[PDB]
Ligand binder design. Sequence first.
Ligand SMILES: N[C@]12C[C@H]3C[C@H](C[C@H](C3)C1)C2
Ligand code: NA
Lengths: 75, 75, 75
Amino acid sequence: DAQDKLKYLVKQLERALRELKKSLDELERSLEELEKNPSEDALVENNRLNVENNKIIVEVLRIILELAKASAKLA
Amino acid sequence: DAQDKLKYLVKQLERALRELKKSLDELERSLEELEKNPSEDALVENNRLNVENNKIIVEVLRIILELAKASAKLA
Amino acid sequence: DAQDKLKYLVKQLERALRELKKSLDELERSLEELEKNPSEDALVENNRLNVENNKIIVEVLRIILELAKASAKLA
Ligand SMILES: N[C@]12C[C@H]3C[C@H](C[C@H](C3)C1)C2
Ligand code: NA
């Protein structure tokens, strides 16, 4: 099953990276707004989006750990 | 040695991801506090925790590079 | 071609991680400055550098996805 499981995990990684890119775009837009008009509200919003981007990164890294675990089997 | 080295590196990745999750939890708690009561102090603390989370991510990515390097040998 | 492509992708990952480390260093310096003398300007600058570090992380993760895709071929 390892090779097929790896195929699925690659699809999961692709999907998560599409989500991560959307997050990064939102974060970059919020940064542009912050730089244009700095304020407490713009700082908080930017931080919020930064934290969410980190969260998604952690999710991506967990999928990569599953790739490594499924690879070990055939190794 | 490559297959055994990969086993060790997977254990390192697991351990680092446990550390990353603890960091992300701390970061998310700091975000909640910031949103509840925004202030300069809460902003700095949240940024601090965000930077630490990035640091840990870089450490995780270096372990993944070692996975790729050890895989190449048997490739 | 998969094994050779993987060699190239490992070189790309190494290069990107050198860039990521330089970014993390800049980010950590900006954090130290922020903690020393907090201000709106120091907050924005730190956020800017944090976002850039996330951007580079996303680039690194895309290289790892290409590693997984090239591995699947020989799997
Ligand atoms: N074989 C691997 C390809 C990719 C990089 C590294 C960790 C995971 C994902 C498995 C080696
Ligand atoms: Na921030």
